[PDB]
Design an enzyme around this catalytic site. Structure first.
Site, PDB file in Angstrom:
ATOM      1  N   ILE A  26     -16.575 -49.866 106.557  1.00 39.41           N
ATOM      2  CA  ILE A  26     -15.882 -51.047 106.053  1.00 39.41           C
ATOM      3  C   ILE A  26     -14.596 -51.355 106.814  1.00 39.41           C
ATOM      4  CG2 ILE A  26     -16.870 -50.516 103.804  1.00 39.41           C
ATOM      5  CD1 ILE A  26     -14.183 -49.836 102.739  1.00 39.41           C
ATOM      6  N   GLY A  27     -13.898 -50.336 107.302  1.00 38.50           N
ATOM      7  CA  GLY A  27     -12.646 -50.614 107.984  1.00 38.50           C
ATOM      8  C   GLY A  27     -12.046 -49.394 108.646  1.00 38.50           C
ATOM      9  N   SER A  28     -10.834 -49.589 109.178  1.00 40.70           N
ATOM     10  CA  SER A  28     -10.096 -48.563 109.902  1.00 40.70           C
ATOM     11  C   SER A  28      -8.729 -48.353 109.263  1.00 40.70           C
ATOM     12  CB  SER A  28      -9.929 -48.941 111.381  1.00 40.70           C
ATOM     13  OG  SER A  28      -8.732 -48.405 111.918  1.00 40.70           O
ATOM     14  N   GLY A  29      -8.318 -47.087 109.158  1.00 38.62           N
ATOM     15  CA  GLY A  29      -7.089 -46.750 108.461  1.00 38.62           C
ATOM     16  C   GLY A  29      -6.117 -45.858 109.211  1.00 38.62           C
ATOM     17  N   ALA A  30      -6.336 -45.658 110.514  1.00 40.58           N
ATOM     18  CA  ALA A  30      -5.442 -44.844 111.337  1.00 40.58           C
ATOM     19  C   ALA A  30      -5.296 -43.426 110.792  1.00 40.58           C
ATOM     20  CB  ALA A  30      -4.068 -45.512 111.455  1.00 40.58           C
ATOM     21  N   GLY A  32      -7.278 -42.228 108.761  1.00 36.22           N
ATOM     22  CA  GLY A  32      -8.648 -41.754 108.680  1.00 36.22           C
ATOM     23  C   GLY A  32      -9.619 -42.915 108.780  1.00 36.22           C
ATOM     24  N   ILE A  33     -10.902 -42.578 108.731  1.00 32.80           N
ATOM     25  CA  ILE A  33     -11.958 -43.577 108.709  1.00 32.80           C
ATOM     26  C   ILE A  33     -12.427 -43.773 107.272  1.00 32.80           C
ATOM     27  CG2 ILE A  33     -13.959 -44.424 109.976  1.00 32.80           C
ATOM     28  CD1 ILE A  33     -12.464 -41.052 110.856  1.00 32.80           C
ATOM     29  N   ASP A 145       7.882 -49.932 105.397  1.00 36.09           N
ATOM     30  CA  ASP A 145       6.875 -50.312 106.397  1.00 36.09           C
ATOM     31  C   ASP A 145       5.695 -51.025 105.745  1.00 36.09           C
ATOM     32  OD1 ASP A 145       6.018 -50.635 109.003  1.00 36.09           O
ATOM     33  OD2 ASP A 145       4.894 -48.765 109.056  1.00 36.09           O
TER      34      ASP A 145
END
Ligand SMILES: Cc1nc2c(cnn2-c2csc(C(=O)NC3COC3)c2)cc1Nc1c(F)cccc1Cl
Length: 346
Positions: A26-30, A32-33, A145
């Site tokens: 579904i997406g990318s989270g830096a 983790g995956i 942030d």
């Protein structure tokens, strides 16, 4: 009989409890995956994030640890809440990966931002942001942030903030996103709670304009975009910078900064009915109190919540929830491993 199993989603291998079925990326989270899945115990859809060897260095470690102890503390409808945490490894010595599980949302706020949104929806998302931020502050957390990629939304317009902000090498391919950080953060300034207001203003302005307000390679470019648009800060704001950073800034070209009607003209707003005309001018008023360089004359989080564009959504049950050992350290990777492990094994 093993309680775990493994599937290939994209490049990453996911080893998860058998209750979780039908994993789809579904997406990318830096950090983790991530994947969507059906949780058969809970009979509902969830999102699963894999943290690979989070202890491998201090940046991953500090973050992973920090966020486990907070997700185990905060409690608010607009702030991530974890449904499960687990590792498929059986001992500390074998411990490698951490899986975090939460309610499955429908979209990342980056996607919502590209959409044309009426005032009902824009004001509601922003109101939820401020509610979540207000909770974080009530819990003694100042984010610093907040950015759209760490914000998710459901089709019904409900919103959640997924991270807890700043505490620094990173030997990776992917870049950190800095476009939403306040001046006090850009400039090494010290800060108070309304540091996060700036980032809200950046998100709201991008919703309107549909481009990043303050892009740049570095803080160099980024400060350039700040003063070109908002005007050079007040000398009184100079006096609060550090001497070296103050010299850099004072020696920047002067700029009058554009008015907010020029920075966000009526073209960008729905302005066909009287109702919409008034909403746009309220919207522009709020923007003008959020996108303010000097924190001293920047609007509060409680004052923003009670702004006319925003306070249409007010409910003392959502801006007024009860806030529940300060960890603040620096260790070796084996030390970080055990610290994280213990938390995984609450
Ligand atoms: C990167 C990320 N995206 C997430 C969630 C929840 N929803 N989404 C999401 C973004 S686009 C999308 C989607 O397209 N959904 C359609 C509906 O059917 C498919 C879902 C969580 C993370 N991260 C994360 C986590 F997964 C677990 C624990 C802690 C964290 Cl921080």
């Amino acid at each position: 009989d093993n309680q775990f199993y493994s599937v290939e989603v994209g490049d990453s291998t996911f080893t998860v409890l058998k209750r979780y079925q039908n994993l789809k990326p579904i997406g990318s989270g830096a950090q983790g995956i991530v994947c969507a899945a059906y949780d058969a115990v809970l009979d509902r859809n969830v999102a699963i994030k894999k943290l690979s060897r989070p202890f491998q260095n201090q940046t991953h470690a500090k973050r992973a640890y920090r966020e486990l102890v907070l997700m185990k503390c905060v409690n608010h409808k607009n702030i991530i809440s974890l449904l499960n945490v687990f590792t498929p490894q059986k001992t500390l010595e074998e411990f490698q990966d951490v899986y975090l599980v939460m309610e499955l949302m429908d979209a990342n706020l980056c996607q919502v931002i590209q959409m044309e949104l009426d005032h009902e929806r824009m004001s509601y998302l922003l109101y939820q942001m401020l509610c979540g931020i207000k909770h974080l502050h009530s819990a003694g957390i100042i984010h610093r942030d907040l950015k759209p990629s760490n914000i998710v939304v459901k089709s019904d317009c409900t919103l959640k903030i997924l991270d807890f902000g700043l505490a620094s090498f990173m030997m990776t391919p992917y870049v950190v996103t800095r476009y939403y950080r306040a001046p006090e953060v850009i400039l090494g300034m010290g800060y108070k709670e309304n540091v996060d207001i700036w980032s809200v203003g950046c998100i709201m302005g991008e919703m309107v304009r549909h481009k990043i307000l303050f892009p740049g390679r570095d803080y160099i470019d980024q400060w350039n975009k700040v003063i070109e648009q908002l005007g050079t800060p007040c000398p009184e704001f100079m006096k609060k910078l550090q001497p070296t950073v103050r010299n850099y800034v004072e020696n920047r070209p002067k700029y009058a900064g554009l008015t907010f009607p020029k920075l966000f003209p009526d073209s960008l707003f729905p302005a066909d009915s009287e109702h919409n005309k008034l909403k746009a001018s309220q919207a522009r008023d709020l923007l003008s109190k959020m996108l303010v360089i000097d924190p001293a004359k920047r609007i509060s989080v409680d004052d923003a919540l009670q702004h006319p564009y925003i306070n249409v959504w007010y409910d003392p049950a959502e801006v007024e929830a009860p806030p529940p050992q300060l960890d603040e350290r620096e260790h070796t990777i084996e030390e970080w491993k055990e610290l994280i492990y213990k938390e995984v094994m609450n």
